[PDB]
Amino acid sequence: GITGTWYNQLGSTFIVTAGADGALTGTYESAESRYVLTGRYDSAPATDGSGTALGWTVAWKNNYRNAHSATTWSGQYVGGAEARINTQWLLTSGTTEANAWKSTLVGHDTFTKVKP
Amino acid sequence: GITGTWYNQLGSTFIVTAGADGALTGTYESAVGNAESRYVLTGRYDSAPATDGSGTALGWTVAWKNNYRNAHSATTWSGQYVGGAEARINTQWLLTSGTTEANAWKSTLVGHDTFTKVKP
Amino acid sequence: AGITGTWYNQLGSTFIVTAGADGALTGTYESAVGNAESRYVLTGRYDSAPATDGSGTALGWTVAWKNNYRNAHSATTWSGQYVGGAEARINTQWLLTSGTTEANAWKSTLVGHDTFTKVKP
Amino acid sequence: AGITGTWYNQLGSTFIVTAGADGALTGTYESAVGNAESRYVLTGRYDSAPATDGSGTALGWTVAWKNNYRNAHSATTWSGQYVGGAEARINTQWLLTSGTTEANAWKSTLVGHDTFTKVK
Ligand SMILES: COC(=O)c1cccc(-c2cc3c(=O)[nH]ccc3o2)c1
Ligand SMILES: COC(=O)c1cccc(-c2cc3c(=O)[nH]ccc3o2)c1
């Protein structure tokens, strides 16, 4: 249920293949705009109504731009008629030590299979 | 650089390779939690960082399933590598467990780990 | 209109708050989840002179989960901003830390996000 | 309770708090220098009847970064636990939210951690 195209609340698109070995691979488009993503998921989740745990990372460098930063999303996939990937994220920028206190933003993204 | 064997402040072991393409690959052995032996990790890093003294941004994920245990959970670490005399990777992390919807509000733990190339 | 009033989050918790002229937040919180029963004291702070460029109003508050009925040995802080408009909203992220031993401190803190409206969802 | 008094973080910030009998935290948060322009009101809550099994004491507090001299249009909350003893600590994680437009709300909140001690 994870493999495919997902859309967040703010116009980003998250394209992923969930491999048999637990790998997540794909591309993330935040709007020149496409970036590699890589992560992991629980390939043997419970079958009791619980979600499937997962996470992935995008480093914001491609052949066109480099923000010197990376985001990790941590969350769970929930299947069914209104399937979702519900996540919280951390976005760390490369900084000097003096600016490291303000290096990390936090937020949350909800992904759906149908454009918002 | 990033490639090497690292240890967090609690004794976990982070064996990572930073590839030419921005890929992080390797294994993680946890000193806490419902964990036993090595787990696969994968992630990404900035392969062309700034040249102004700033650190190198990175992140990686471990899903806590291997051939011996499955905790139905996954941790992501987000941080930066800082070079120098004692190289360091400073991170914050999120650990999400699979839950029912009614329990989703308590699904995610947060903390911070610092990694060096020497054991604590 | 403003921060003062009765608010509800997406899970049905009830947040009754007064925003004082000095920047103070006071009131009570009743949680729809967790080891909680009835109302708990909250205190916090807000920006009493927000920017005039369309930005929201920054704020935060704390509940320690002890009252006359129960004590969960934990505390939540919500950090967020009030957004005025047709449907007023307070958007927050929160940290819930439990008292633990040192060996369990790594798993002491939960994180999440709550959105509050003056209309109960 | 051991909480009342002056505490110092790892980066040169100071706070002076009073822990009231029924769970109130009140005080001031400032910089190491301590000039009036760096001082802000703080308010929060703590568990006034913690466990007796060796666990820490849960607490939290908020500073809105407005005083009579400047206004950053932002607020920080610290969530953590107090641990007593000869090397007492308050170990926290924090969230700093700025007032933003909706278009910029995705980047409104910074996260980090502070460790407070009784000595600078
Ligand atoms: C439900 O399962 C878990 O909560 C669990 C299981 C196994 C290992 C971990 C673990 C290890 C580790 C670490 O070294 N640093 C930061 C977080 C973290 O989490 C967590
Ligand atoms: C194990 O959990 C607790 O110790 C506990 C006890 C009482 C209430 C809560 C509670 C309510 C609430 C909420 O509405 N939003 C965000 C966090 C949050 O936490 C947690």
- Assign domain B1-119 to a CATH class: mainly beta
Q: Which two tokens stand for residue A44?
A: 């043997």
All residues at 6 or more sequence positions from A91 whose CB lies less than 8 Å from its CB, including other chains? A69, A70, A71, A104, A105, A106, A107, B78
Q: How far apart are CA D56 and CA D85, in angstroms?
A: 11
Q: How far apart are CA D27 and CA D4, in angstroms?
A: 9
Resolution (A): 1.5
- b/e burial code for range C4-27 (CB count within 10 A of at least 16 → b): eeebbbeeebbbebebeeebbbbb
Asked: is C2-120 a CATH 3.40.50.300 domain? The reply is no
Whether the Cβ atoms of residue A59 and residue B23 lie closer than 8 Å to each other: no
What DSSP character marks residue B109?
A: E
**Contact (CB<8Å) C58/D99:** yes
Residue A2: alpha-carbon gap to chain centroid: 12
From chain B, the residues in CB contact with A21 under 8 A are: 40
- In angstroms, the Cα distances linking D98 to B31, C18, C76, D77, D89 are 36, 21, 19, 12, 28
Other residues' Cβ atoms within 10 Å of the Cβ of residue D82: 23
A&C contacts, CB < 8 Å: 8
Q: How far apart are CA B62 and CA B46, in angstroms?
A: 19
**Contact (CB<8Å) D44/C47:** no
- b/e burial code for range B75-112 (CB count within 10 A of at least 16 → b): bbbbbbbbeeeeebbbbbbbbbbbbeeeebbebbbbbb
- In angstroms, the Cα distances linking B4 to A92, C49, C106, D76 are 21, 51, 25, 36
Hey, where are the domains in chain B?
Answer: 1-119
- CA within 13 Å, CB half, C49: 9
Instruction: Name all contacts of B28-35 with Cβ < 8 Å and 24+ positions apart.
Output: B28/B62, B30/B62, B30/B64, B32/C106, B32/C107, B33/B64, B33/B71, B33/C106, B33/C107, B34/B64, B34/B69, B34/B71, B34/B73, B35/B64, B35/B69, B35/B71
**Superfamily of domain covering A1-115:** Avidin-like (2.40.128.30)
Determine if ligand 2 sits within 6 Å of the CB of residue C31. Answer: yes
Find residue C96's DSSP bridge partners. Answer: C76, C110
Phi-psi region of D34 (alpha: psi -120 to 50; beta: other; left: phi over 0): left
Return the closest-CA partner of residue D94 out of D58, D50, D63, D56. Answer: D63
All residues at 6 or more sequence positions from D104 whose CB lies less than 8 Å from its CB, including other chains? none
From chain D, the residues in CB contact with A107 under 8 A are: 106-107, 109
Phi-psi region of B31 (alpha: psi -120 to 50; beta: other; left: phi over 0): alpha
- In angstroms, the Cα distances linking B80 to A71, B1, C47, C80 are 11, 12, 32, 26
**What technique solved it?**
X-ray
Q: Is D82 annotated as a binding residue?
A: no
Longest dimension (CA), chain D: 48
How remote is the CA of residue C31 from the centroid of ligand 2, in Å?
Answer: 6
Q: How far apart are CA D63 and CA C6, in angstroms?
A: 22
Torsion angle, CA of C22/C28/C31/C37, rounded to 10 degrees?
Answer: 150
Find residue B35's DSSP bridge partners. Answer: none
Whether the Cβ atoms of residue A101 and residue D112 lie closer than 8 Å to each other: yes
Q: Is B93 annotated as a binding residue?
A: yes
How remote is the CA of residue C113 from the centroid of ligand 1, in Å?
Answer: 21
